[PDB]
Swiss-Prot record, chain A:
Designated name of the protein: Glutamine--fructose-6-phosphate aminotransferase [isomerizing] 1
Gene name as annotated: GFPT1
CC per GO annotation: cytosol; extracellular exosome
Tissue: Isoform 1 is predominantly expressed in skeletal muscle. Not expressed in brain. Seems to be selectively expressed in striated muscle.
Keyword Mitochondrion: no
Subunit structure: Homotetramer, may also exist as homodimers.
Organism: Homo sapiens (Human)
Length: 652, 652
């Protein structure tokens, strides 16, 4: 789940400093409720290194990384003062799956009782049964209930059967992954290759950070098949960081290499090369990420931080992309494709969960400004039906993580059929970001919370900005674009206005504290609002909230309304205003006493309804952002009132 | 909203026979609305009926028709023994979507405290506010908050400002409708015009039945701008104004289906139309419960028969041929189009969701499925080469009808899938199919859903009848249709097993119904049925979306129904079941009989027989229909008359 390794090559570090670096990396990767973690390093207290390289020591523990860090310093035999000019340490944090949390079942997994090979793994080996039986027939005894141990045992099998005494660490790993089936990200360490690391992935993210006070040989590592590698030019000193997430690297360096499926990256003599079995290469790029972005700060939870910082993340999404003087929108990621997109005949938005709601939330304005048909598909269903896709379709894939399975498989489906693919993602280097022809990084910052908050609103704004590009040549739409863009200009301050009503939301959370259901009703631009709000309250509050399209009430669902059923209705001053007034009269006529989220100046309804949240008025195709935030906050406060940890996931 | 009036010209009927006839006609229309009812007849207790037509009596009460039938009786002032040789009585049941269902807001409305003009109205007047102000200035006092009172107060304004002393009742009504906007179906009665009825319409149904032992003068009344329909040789005739054919079939099968702006009038027992007389293709048995306790139960258990009727004369199993006569002169042009759009509401929308996949498979065209209300809110792009389907049991749903006219304006080819011959949607569509499911009386659609399902499948079988590669697939499906009626009987034989399950859920507040693929519509339709008639908080959840939030709502106390069938999504649905169980859920599973795997590992299962994947949805939804039925009975509710709504939403 969380991989981190630190390789210091001719950068002298003490064992204390090394272990501190490993522990700190796991804290960046540790999320609420990780049960097992461990570290692997060179044991032995012989003065100076080189003699302590043939003693791999493991310290694994069941619990949080805090307990591990205490165990690290709770070692009487170890001396934390030895200095290593060259050393490789690896670490892992996990939520136990194949087995039960126990020190043995934690990572790293070892190849034997002397720890000749150890490995840390993210993923699942589907065929680990066949592999385990084979290794046992060849005489390898197992000790854990994990599929990872088969990896440690298999690499030693390849070593015990090597043809020459100097077969590379890379070759051994290559022979291992050939026998593996499923998804994996791996980092290997061995006494037979002191100071060397090998990292490889298949369907699981893995990256390498590099730092050196000296110039590096290149910024584009070429691939070697079965100048040519990265290394400090005029000196040896260099540091490498393997990790499954940039969060554990950004505080040490912002220069990273994203590995790809079946890449085998190896560090030999302090030099990094990337091998393949099959010119192309892997780029050393600069991440805009910052350590402060993955911290709670003064907020008591990541959910609270990411809700209340939405004035900032919205501004981050638009920076360098909008100009309110000449009313121009420039999404850099679509420069080399915007003209081709405009020659296509249909837009298909494919996503899961809240990302899908972002498409529902912008479907109308995309239809309005592109004038093309716009299909919005749930990825899982999109695949089940084998949806017809064509070469003149443009397919969008909305994914904060860029790794969701069904969305990624939908991407590959549409590529097979020759469609133009576009990514709306929030993770640089992710599978969906790489494999899409083009796209937009919404630049919302890392989303650490359990539920999507700023990602939904940054996706929202990103699609609106795209729609504004698609109509930049239409005279008849110049005024509509100005209205929308002046809405984006004012949007950050309007969000602050909504957040300032947090006290009113808590009063609503008190009303619904003891309730077991709540219907959220909306239509038009706010169909997505009531769907997203119902999902948030389900995911965070664990109560039965359901979004109901207002225009469907009189077709059945209205039967639920009575004096006891809590109802939240969204009524804004747009073209559907009178229709929403109609639905309100239908609810009240059946003893419903709903709460209404309406515009700040809607004096007509504020005097008729029980309780009303009064959000500020904005352009119709942006109101969804302002009207969903009270539902974000409502889920947060309800969960807190009930003693729940909003940063602790339940689905798992 | 239903209309019914009884005019017996020279056919002696006592005041008890007329009132019993008015109430009996409303009961035939009660399913179109049951929040209030009323009647309007002649008062006074004079043996000579001629000296009583100057006194109008209104009896209106809140509740169903049974509340009115008891209010009409046990009255100390109305002598039910007066013989009327000529009399006109109007009645009306109301679906109070707004305001209170009080007697004052019920119909017939009145023009003054003496009841000089009373009217019954079905629809909405879109400018009743401007008409109310004008009438209030001229000295007319209003009492109710309905839009129908503006029609009663206006016909008196045209009568108080007439040019000649003998302006026909038609002339007065003609001047009224010229000031009315929107849709309406009206039936007037006045003391100045004793026994004279006037029936006009505009966007609302309104027919006139006739019964007479004597020959009728003609069989095609000529419209005006050797003229009237009346008995030859004698005067005995009985008329039956009604907004539906079920209230007239019991007395006669000879009606006159008016058209928009046709002002029918019965003067001296002669029917004339200002500005056909066909036989009804309906039998009385089709609108009778028979041996069942409710119409819904009948219409569920008669699905084996209604499915056969939908295929009658259309599916030939000896040679595996499909021919839908309604699409004969259009099937070739439909194939040259580039997209299908299905537009409907509620259960009719689910019928499209249930057939979207197979339509995509056999036509290879894009298939977009739209909720009518949202389709209109977004101004969805439509083109000339679009084929737009409109699924409507009643053929009068406002939003579905608006979508039709919307698509027609953009030059799309429009196709109707309806169950009511001569309805708005059936007439205004270019072509279509009458599903021939028979009259549906229960508010909740049961046989209409499965008949729409089958009808869209038959269309798909036509669209691929020239593909060699699809021949075996067609035969597979058609064999499934041949076996479908008997498999429905097999499901119905499990009614008792369903009733037992109901006794284990009726006390619960919520139930989650989960499904994917072909059974996404099944869990959406079942959730809607349980909402509508049992008032449980039932929600359908696409199985593939569980891992994206909703799964957090599942615990050992949340009821869950899962649909796991033997199609290509079986392995994925087994994964969902495992997720639900990991969350401590104890789900009820609707699965296939041969699915011994699921049956063994689940204590509560409903085993339905196997069929073709694209037909299984018909068999999987029937248990949920029955479950909703039994749950409602256990909770003490009337399955035919659910609360807060009625059947057919003909007014938005
Ligand atoms: C990742 C990166 O270095 N982005 C830089 C880019 O931002 P810029 O906004 O110009 O472009 P993006 O960050 O949005 O995307 C970067 C590239 O990845 C592609 N892409 C992105 C998302 C996706 O889902 N699929 C996809 O293919 C884009 O088409 C584009 O070619 O120029 C800016 C300078 O003006 C820098 O501040 C940004 O650091
Ligand atoms: C109403 C009628 O007399 N139908 C006859 C017709 O049925 P048949 O099955 O041939 O055609 P339908 O009854 O389904 O429809 C009748 C006509 O109305 C049109 N239409 C129907 C539904 C709709 O929603 N929109 C629309 O425009 C059809 O295109 C068609 O032109 O031939 C059969 C003999 O084989 C007879 O048993 C049916 O009595
Ligand atoms: O709050 C809910 C979750 O965020 C849920 O909606 C879903 O898991 C994502 O929205 C989709 O995942 P990606 O956004 O990473 O594609
Ligand atoms: O059980 C629910 C009802 O059947 C309802 O959903 C109905 O389908 C629509 O309200 C109108 O649709 P029609 O136009 O087909 O009558
Ligand atoms: Mg890319
Ligand atoms: Mg027609």
């Amino acid at each position: 789940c969380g991989i981190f390794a630190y390789l210091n090559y001719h950068v002298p570090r003490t064992r204390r400093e090394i272990l501190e670096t490993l522990i700190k990396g796991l804290q960046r990767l540790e999320y609420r409720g990780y049960d097992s973690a461990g570290v692997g390093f060179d044991g032995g207290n012989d003065k100076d290194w080189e003699a302590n390289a043939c003693k791999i020591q493991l310290i694994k523990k069941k619990g949080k990384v805090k307990a591990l860090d205490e165990e690290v310093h709770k070692q009487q035999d170890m001396d934390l003062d030895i200095e290593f000019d060259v050393h490789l340490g690896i670490a892992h944090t996990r939520w136990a799956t194949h087995g039960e949390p126990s020190p043995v079942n934690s990572h790293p997994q070892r190849s034997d009782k002397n720890n000749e090979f150890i490995v840390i793994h993210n993923g699942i080996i589907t065929n680990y049964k066949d592999l385990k039986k084979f290794l046992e027939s060849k005489g390898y005894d197992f000790e854990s209930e994990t599929d990872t141990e088969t990896i440690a045992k298999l690499v030693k099998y390849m070593y015990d059967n090597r043809e020459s005494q100097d077969t590379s660490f890379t070759t051994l790993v290559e022979r291992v992954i050939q026998q593996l089936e499923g998804a994996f990200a791996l980092v290997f360490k061995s006494v037979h290759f002191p100071g060397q690391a090998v990292g490889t992935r298949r369907g699981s993210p893995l990256l390498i950070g590099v730092r050196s006070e000296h110039k590096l040989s290149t910024d584009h590592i070429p691939i070697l098949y079965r100048t040519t590698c990265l290394f400090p030019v005029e000196e040896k000193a260099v540091e490498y960081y393997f990790a499954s997430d940039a969060s554990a690297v950004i505080e040490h360096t912002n220069r990273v290499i994203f590995l790809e499926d079946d890449d085998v990256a190896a560090v030999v003599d302090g030099r990094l090369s990337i091998h393949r079995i099959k010119h192309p290469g892997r780029a050393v790029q600069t991440l805009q990420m910052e350590l402060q972005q993955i911290m709670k700060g003064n907020f008591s939870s990541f959910m609270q931080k990411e809700i209340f910082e939405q004035p900032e993340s919205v501004v981050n999404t638009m920076r360098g992309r909008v100009n309110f003087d000449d009313y121009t929108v420039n999404l850099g990621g679509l420069k080399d494709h915007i003209k081709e997109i405009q020659r296509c005949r249909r837009l298909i938005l494919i996503a899961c969960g809240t990302s899908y709601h972002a498409g529902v939330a912008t479907r109308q304005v995309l239809e309005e400004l592109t004038e093309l048909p716009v299909m919005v598909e749930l990825a899982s269903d999109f695949l089940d039906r084998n949806t017809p896709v064509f070469r003149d379709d443009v397919c969008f894939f909305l994914s904060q993580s860029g790794e969701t399975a069904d969305t990624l498989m939908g991407l590959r489906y549409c590529k097979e059929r020759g469609a133009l693919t576009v990514g709306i993602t929030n993770t640089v280097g992710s599978s969906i970001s790489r494999e899409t022809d083009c796209g937009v990084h919404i630049n919302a910052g890392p989303e650490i919370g359990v539920a999507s908050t700023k990602a939904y609103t940054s996706q929202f704004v990103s699609l609106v900005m795209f729609a504004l590009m698609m109509c930049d040549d239409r005279i008849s739409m110049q005024e509509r674009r100005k209205e929308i863009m002046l809405g984006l200009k004012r949007l950050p301050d309007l969000i602050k206005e909504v957040l300032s009503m947090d006290d009113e939301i808590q009063k609503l959370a008190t009303e619904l504290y003891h309730q077991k259901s709540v219907l959220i009703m909306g239509r038009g631009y706010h169909y997505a609002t009531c769907l997203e709000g119902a999902l948030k309250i389900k995911e965070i509050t664990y109560m039965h909230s359901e979004g109901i399209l207002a225009g469907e009430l009189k077709h059945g669902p209205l039967a639920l309304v009575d004096k006891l059923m809590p109802v939240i209705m969204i009524i804004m001053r747009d073209h559907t205003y009178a229709k929403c007034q109609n639905a309100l009269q239908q609810v009240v006529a059946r003893q419903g006493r709903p709460v209404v989220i309406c515009d700040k100046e809607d004096t007509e309804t504020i005097k008729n309804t029980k309780r009303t949240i009064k959000v500020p008025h904005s352009v119709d195709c942006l109101q969804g952002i302002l009207s969903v935030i009270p539902l974000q906050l409502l889920a947060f406060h309800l969960a807190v009132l009930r003693g729940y940890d909003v940063d602790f996931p339940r689905n798992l």
